[PDB]
Amino acid sequence: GPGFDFAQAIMKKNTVVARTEKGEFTMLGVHDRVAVIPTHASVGETIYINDVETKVLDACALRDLTDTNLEITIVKLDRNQKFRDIRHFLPRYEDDYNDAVLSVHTSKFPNMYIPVGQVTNYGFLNLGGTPTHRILMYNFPTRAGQCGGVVTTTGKVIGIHVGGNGAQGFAAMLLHSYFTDTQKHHHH
Amino acid sequence: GPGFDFAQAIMKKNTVVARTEKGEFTMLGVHDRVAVIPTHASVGETIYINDVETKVLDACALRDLTDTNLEITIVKLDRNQKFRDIRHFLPRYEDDYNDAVLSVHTSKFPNMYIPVGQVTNYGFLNLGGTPTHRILMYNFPTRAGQCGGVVTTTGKVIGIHVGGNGAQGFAAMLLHSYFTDTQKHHHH
């Protein structure tokens, strides 16, 4: 069934607890000192990472070419260790998936794994009043405190949890191309 | 690492959500219509099982020969399906264990898996003011709503969660001999 061993390896080497004015979130480190967190975390210029106050060197709230929220924020942090590079486990394209795990790492739940079954490419979602694109959906109840939970299948990190109603959960897609080294562009 | 596949098989075929005046508990079905739940659930003469009201035909709050609480209650239920017989997965003796999973099944968390690392035979525990014997301990924080969570290692169901402080969790041991067909004795 589920790739529990894979989800477990991602959680140990590549997640941290992040805390902003908005609360705590599971935060996925991706490569070097680059990580992701849901845009609703409202990242500022400092953040707590495992309860250590950390300078945010860069934060990019992703939107698509329709200027619509994608609900991922890519952050660059001022800290000493690099994350293990997990870009090769990121999907190239939008897709549907079988048998996913949602894993959570917070002060409340420091390591918890939830199979969520099939994951469908859902598309548009109205996410607490913000229109949002590129959403993945799983038919599992959602509870508070799971935001940023990392959604995996064996060998693939496919997105991060961003919301739910009492019956479904929603994750924001991760694509490999969000994290390729690139072009000289004024971003702020 | 952890036997996630084993814990998952136990959860699917052998647990139900039980609800008493005291709240909800993960309930482990053991064989026929016999199950266990923590003594602190305060089982009466009817109980809800997956939100269906069910007659309790028998409840035995286990104590040892020192007349001390063991915090397991064995219940016999009036319901149509039998549980898959999992007695052969019960340990013969007290023991310590490597790499356990704690799995929870409630309306809040319908399927959640938590590795808790090493499990030690701890013995005496003062459990909210009730002295209690035969306790297993794991060095993992405890959160509310996990009572009755089933503690496994691959091929062994070793106990059920009964409490914790902010740093450790405690499970009540399950032993094979709690469930062998037996002698003619007035029990009530």
> Which class for B64: exposed (0-12), middle (13-18), buried (19 or more C-beta within 10 A)?
exposed
For residues A107 and A56, membership in a common domain is answered with no
For residues B42 and B79, membership in a common domain is answered with yes
For residues B61 and B114, membership in a common domain is answered with no
For residues B139 and B165, membership in a common domain is answered with yes
> Active site residue: B40, B105, B133, B161, which one?
B40
CA gap A97, B76 in Å, rounded:
41
Query: Residues of A with CB below 8 A from B2's CB?
Result: 4, 8
Q: Is the minimum CB–CB distance between A8 and chain B shorter than 8 Å?
A: yes
CA atoms within 13 A on the CB side of A10: 35
Residues B38, B128 contacting (CB under 8 angstroms):
no
Residue A160: both structure tokens together = 């991060």
CA-based nearest residue in chain B for residue A2 = B5
- Chain B (101-120) residues lying within 8 Å, Cβ to Cβ, of chain A: 108-115
Residue B72: both structure tokens together = 């397991």
Q: Could you give the 3-state DSSP secondary structure of residue B149?
A: coil
In degrees and rounded to multiples of 5, residue B111 shows phi and psi of -165, 105
Kindly determine whether residue A143 and residue B109, on different chains, have CB atoms separated by under 8 Å. Answer: yes
For residues A76 and A114, membership in a common domain is answered with no
For residues B20 and B10, membership in a common domain is answered with no
CATH number at residue B46: 2.40.10.10
The technique is X-ray
Q: Is the minimum CB–CB distance between A1 and chain B shorter than 8 Å?
A: yes
Residues A77, A46 contacting (CB under 8 angstroms):
no
> Active site residue: B24, B105, B133, B147, which one?
B147
CA gap B115, B3 in Å, rounded:
9
For residues B24 and B56, membership in a common domain is answered with yes
CA gap A127, A137 in Å, rounded:
13
Kindly determine whether residue B110 and residue A141, on different chains, have CB atoms separated by under 8 Å. Answer: yes
Residues in Cβ contact with B9 at an 8 Å cutoff, skipping those fewer than 6 apart: none
Query: Residues of B with CB below 8 A from A143's CB?
Result: 108-109
Q: Is the minimum CB–CB distance between B54 and chain A shorter than 8 Å?
A: no
CA gap B69, A166 in Å, rounded:
38
From its phi and psi, is residue B6 left (phi > 0), alpha (psi between -120 and 50) or beta?
A: alpha
Residues B136, B121 contacting (CB under 8 angstroms):
yes
For residues B97 and B19, membership in a common domain is answered with no
Question: Count of A–B CB contacts within 8 Å?
Answer: 37
CA gap A139, B136 in Å, rounded:
35
For residues A107 and A161, membership in a common domain is answered with yes
> How many distinct structural domains can be found in chain B?
2
E runs forming strands in chain B: 15-20, 23-31, 34-38, 46-49, 52-63, 69-77, 97-104, 112-127, 130-138, 150-153, 156-164, 169-173
Residue B159: both structure tokens together = 């106990």
Provide the residue range defining the domain that includes B8.
1-14+84-188
For residues B158 and B182, membership in a common domain is answered with yes
For residues B98 and B74, membership in a common domain is answered with no
Boundary-marking domain end, from B83, B98, B115: B83
**How close, in Å, is residue A9 to chain B by CA atoms?**
10
Q: Of B2, B165, B124, B150, which Cα lies nearest the Cα of A7?
A: B2
- Please give the C-alpha separations between residue A78 and each of A23, A32, A178, A180, in angstroms, as whole numbers: 20, 11, 20, 20
CA gap B12, B33 in Å, rounded:
16
Other C-beta atoms lying within 10 Å of the C-beta of residue B84: 13
Residues B18, B73 contacting (CB under 8 angstroms):
no
CA gap A149, A187 in Å, rounded:
27
CA gap A1, B9 in Å, rounded:
10
- CA B137 to chain centroid, in Å, comes to 14
Boundary-marking domain end, from B83, B98, B118: B83
For residues A21 and A75, membership in a common domain is answered with yes
- CA B145 to chain centroid, in Å, comes to 13
Residues B160, B26 contacting (CB under 8 angstroms):
yes
* Angle made by CA atoms A168, A171, A177, in degrees to the nearest 5: 155
Query: Residues of A with CB below 8 A from B111's CB?
Result: 114-115
Boundary-marking domain end, from B26, B51, B83: B83
Of B1, B5, B108, the CB nearest to A8: B1
Q: Is the minimum CB–CB distance between B154 and chain A shorter than 8 Å?
A: no
